[PDB]
Symmetry: D2
Amino acid sequence: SAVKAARYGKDNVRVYKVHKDEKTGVQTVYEMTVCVLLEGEIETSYTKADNSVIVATDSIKNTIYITAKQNPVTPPELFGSILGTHFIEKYNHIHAAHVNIVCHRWTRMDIDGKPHPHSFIRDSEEKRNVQVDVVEGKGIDIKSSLSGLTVLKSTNSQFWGFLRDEYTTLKETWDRILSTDVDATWQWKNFSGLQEVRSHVPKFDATWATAREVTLKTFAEDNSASVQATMYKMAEQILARQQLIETVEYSLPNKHYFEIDLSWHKGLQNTGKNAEVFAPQSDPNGLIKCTVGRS
Amino acid sequence: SAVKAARYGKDNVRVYKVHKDEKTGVQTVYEMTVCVLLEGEIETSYTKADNSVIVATDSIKNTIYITAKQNPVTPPELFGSILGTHFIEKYNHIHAAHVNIVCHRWTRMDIDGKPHPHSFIRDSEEKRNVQVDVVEGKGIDIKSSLSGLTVLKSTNSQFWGFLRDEYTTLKETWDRILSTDVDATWQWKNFSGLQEVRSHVPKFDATWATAREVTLKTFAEDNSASVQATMYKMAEQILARQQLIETVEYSLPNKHYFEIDLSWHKGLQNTGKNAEVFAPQSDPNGLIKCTVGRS
Amino acid sequence: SAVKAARYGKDNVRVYKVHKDEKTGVQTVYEMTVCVLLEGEIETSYTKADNSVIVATDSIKNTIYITAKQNPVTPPELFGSILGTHFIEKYNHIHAAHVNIVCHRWTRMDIDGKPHPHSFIRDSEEKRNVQVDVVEGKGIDIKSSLSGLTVLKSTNSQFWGFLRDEYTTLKETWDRILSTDVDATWQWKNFSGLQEVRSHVPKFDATWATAREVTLKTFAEDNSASVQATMYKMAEQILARQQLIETVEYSLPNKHYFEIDLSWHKGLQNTGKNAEVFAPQSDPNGLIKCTVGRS
Amino acid sequence: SAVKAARYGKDNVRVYKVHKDEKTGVQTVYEMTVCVLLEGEIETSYTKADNSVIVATDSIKNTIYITAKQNPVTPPELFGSILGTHFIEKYNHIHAAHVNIVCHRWTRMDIDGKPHPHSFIRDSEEKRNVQVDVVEGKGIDIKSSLSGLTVLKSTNSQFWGFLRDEYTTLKETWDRILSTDVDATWQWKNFSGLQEVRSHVPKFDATWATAREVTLKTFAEDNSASVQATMYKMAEQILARQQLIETVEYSLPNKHYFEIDLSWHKGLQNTGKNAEVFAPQSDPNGLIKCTVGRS
Ligand SMILES: O=c1[nH]c(=O)c2nn[nH]c2[nH]1
Ligand SMILES: O=c1[nH]c(=O)c2nn[nH]c2[nH]1
Ligand SMILES: O=c1[nH]c(=O)c2nn[nH]c2[nH]1
Ligand SMILES: O=c1[nH]c(=O)c2nn[nH]c2[nH]1
Ligand code: NA
Ligand code: NA
Ligand code: NA
Ligand code: NA
Ligand SMILES: [Xe]
Ligand SMILES: [Xe]
Ligand SMILES: [Xe]
Ligand SMILES: [Xe]
């Protein structure tokens, strides 16, 4: 037998950083969960019990904190690239670093119509994420994403004209509820290294904001023919607005809300045009994915 | 042996309701999870296998949907009181109904600065809850609450002057992070029945809004001497603003963020006044509770 | 306003302890999650910012570890009583301690038919729990429980003869699936203090074992007329076997498995006597409770 | 823009099946969660709102139940292959089916030393899983796995001789706790189609049993030099025992248990050779992966 692939590191490293403006007194907080996995010439740790090749996962944890102390942690695409580059430059035998960052929301509170200098609220479990793969001699590959964005529209969704055969019971509909949890990923063109990532720093926050705005507006305004058709419209617009993105991937559950027939009870009308009370279904759920790229 | 207490019913009943304004085209959605447990002369179902006394839990589920179809579901204090009253009036041998409702957030989306007529976002897992106990001959007892409100302040929290003995290692501090998940419950004076609950309908939403506003403002503005002292200030203000509340209960975790000493690494300074990077602790956590009532 | 009730302490304290037999080489591990909340003359910490009355929650955490180092951690009823007693004896102004312990399973592995001296498996998320309330001048109240015991029987459950009215759609049945997660609590007679708890130490493990055995056997063998009737049989037997128990409480979800009518597809028969494939329902669920005591 | 990749289907489909032996009266239950995603000539559903190419996800759900009614559901490798093949054969324009199955444990109860005919317990959240990819013209690729197998050993784990530099604080150790949640996957050689999968049916259950047995024995008996070295030993043995496996992948968290220095309290000795009470750490955790194949 032989080692075909190996990676190891530290997962679930929670990090908080505060920035204090001494002039204004305003404080800004960042909180992340970080994972770093390394690859390289480490096979002998597995095959021969040779620990000399192992950068301890505990040391990887220390490095994450030290790097956060000495560098900006925002945008996460930059922080991830700094962190990954560190490992491939410091250790001759490490040739790839894989950095995953989940950013948690701490939104500044408004008190009496004014932004508070040092108080924050977690407004939703929506996350902003990055996956950064730093590979020696091959540059830096960055996938940016938003996830956990949960939305619902109560009308202006349709689903008719699908294949009907002996396995089909679903009725066609011209008016239904559509609800989903949005997972959207945009993949950047390969960057040659840290200098190039630094040169594009302003684009990271702007593209995240654009992706979020396009997702929300398209969901709200599209008279949806299907989840498939609506998600494609979203992806098309993001690619049109940022030339440095190569692909956009959406993964969307279809979280079903079922009509409840109450006619058995005193002829009560609660279906079709009379539907007011519905039963949200926890499972099963549709799952629709697509990756959109350039012509 | 004898049955000392018994209750049974249906838990985890998910309900969605839509209201459609035909004039404006504006739609408003409500989504809840409901639990209903009944008590009464039902001992024989346990002791003698006498099912004749059992209103099937499946029927309780049907009743929740029918009641939602025929009545407003907001404020939840009203809906819960209607639902509980139904069971004690319909069934001679049922003498108490216990209704728990969790309300999920569906906040109307703003698209291009305008409120959208039929599109909604889940902005946080904060819940608004009610517990309604309807007891035949003893009226209606309502506890209203908010939960899952997660906040953090990065300064203006202190903790010094506590008891020090041979079990104590904690250092006194004049500047720390304070973060918590707020669970706040206000208990209404007993209501004589549904007519009285109806008479106070406007107070329910207003008191929830007040409780939330007082919680946020006090947290943000108090130069906190302890979680204990800050929570008491919150409770005092709520009781002052709504005479129909008898008690306010807060239950607050103290979610710790620890300093990280980096001095071992090239003399790096990251403690006390130089603290920038912290380690959020998943566990253990302080847990502080208090119930405040009137003199 | 006035403080009506207050308690505070440390939650989610994870503790592991190993016992090493030097003679045999056999090692035995225990792992728990502990919560300790205190009450007493502490109102001034809330009302006047007087921290002098506060035993820091951090110190409570230290105390849990020190107490585990110096005492047996099994049975948990004993450990909880030692821990609670410590606080009321050490601190003049603390008058009640509330200790909750969750015990996690680490079951010794069998390798090649022999018990391994130092290797363990988590066989299920079933827990053994204790709640110990130590109140100065009023002794020690102990509630012991098992929870997270998940079982299913595929036949020998019935449910017919229930109330039928205009809210009822449920069909009577003489053969159904019954599945539940068992939560069972036995409450001990009040103990005068630690000496009395020590005197009954062998009864704690034996009663837990009896409660588990009675639950499993009764579930498996009863031709169940309802969840209500089966749970009562369980409780009756436990009370008969341990005179020092005052009450037994069961709380049982009814986790539904629905028939799937496939007749629309080529006349396929999958209901009643022909039912083979079912759809487990995540929600809603029946919830049935009862507390059984002595005549 | 263009669709680069697309797949869609139904996730989280819970299925239960019972087998009844009429001769012996013995019943056997199976419970799974199933996901099926399809690929093929479906781009126009995304780009042109052409639903005619869509097999509704609701119909996919129906198909899972019908297929379970008409076929064995065990071993899951066979059921998954039947299910996937169905879609590529039935629908001309569907060219790949991806089937994921999670099998839940229902272990027959022993009552008074005898196996019960129709009563079952969930002994742990350990799962047996399959991923089956059925691709038209390219056969059937099956990855089998076990996950959620949680183990701990209290001694006979070491970790010394790792790289030490200015980022390192971890002390070398010759005796530590090792605990992990095992995720192990074995990938079968490509099968030409359903006939070939059928021909190997007995190997599926036997290989799962072997993988589990090798994992447990190696964990228990290895005087572990590192997680890396121990996991490699496991993988090597599985590959030696089943020639139809091409690769074995392990993914193992290192769930840390930290010593607690109690020396500050009355010189209490609880480190190194005197360590008895430890603090389990919820996060962060080491994460170690490896894929082992043939020379
Ligand atoms: O077994 C281990 N492997 C590792 O790579 C490691 N790093 N820190 N501790 C460790 N333990
Ligand atoms: O065992 C049961 N008890 C009940 O109260 C009930 N209600 N519906 N089905 C039921 N099954
Ligand atoms: O606000 C606090 N209250 C307490 O009781 C406590 N104990 N440790 N830290 C603390 N912080
Ligand atoms: O938008 C939808 N897309 C689908 O593929 C589907 N299948 N059933 N319902 C559906 N809704
Ligand atoms: Na390198
Ligand atoms: Na009544
Ligand atoms: Na005392
Ligand atoms: Na095909
Ligand atoms: Xe969508
Ligand atoms: Xe607080
Ligand atoms: Xe039961
Ligand atoms: Xe391991």
